[PDB]
Amino acid sequence: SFVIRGDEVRQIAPGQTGKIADYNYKLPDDFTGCVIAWNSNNLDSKVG
Amino acid sequence: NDILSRLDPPEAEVQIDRLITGRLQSLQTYVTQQLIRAAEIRASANLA
Numbered sequence: 001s002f003v004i005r006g007d008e009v010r011q012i013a014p015g016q017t018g019k020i021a022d023y024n025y026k027l028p029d030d031f032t033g034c035v036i037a038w039n040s041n042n043l044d045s046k047v048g
Numbered sequence: 049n050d051i052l053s054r055l056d057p058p059e060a061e062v063q064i065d066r067l068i069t070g071r072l073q074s075l076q077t078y079v080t081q082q083l084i085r086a087a088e089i090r091a092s093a094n095l096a
Contacts, residue, residue: 015058029058 003044009037 004011004020011021014029021027051063 015056017056029061 003040004037006039012037 002025008018008020010016011018012025012027012035013021014027014031016027051060051067054060055063
């Protein structure tokens with residue numbers, strides 16, 4: 001469980017290349033599981 | 049080596065699988081040709 005940016009959603013997939021996928025969380029090519037995400041702009045966003 | 053140095057691993061694995069598939073078909077055709085030629089050679093040797 002973690003909270004990422006809107007453009008970073010795709011990166012969590014087997015064999016993807018990106019900043020998050022290379023430096024924060026890498027997923028193996030032979031991954032057997034699932035990825036679940038939903039928008040939370042109403043919760044994890046201050047007014048400032 | 050060009051495939052490994054050029055392509056990302058998820059597609060490079062598919063390319064390597066295709067290459068080794070073609071190469072193993074070539075190997076087994078060569079081996080069966082050697083087998084039937086050796087059968088002919090063994091028949092000739094038995095005759096001799």
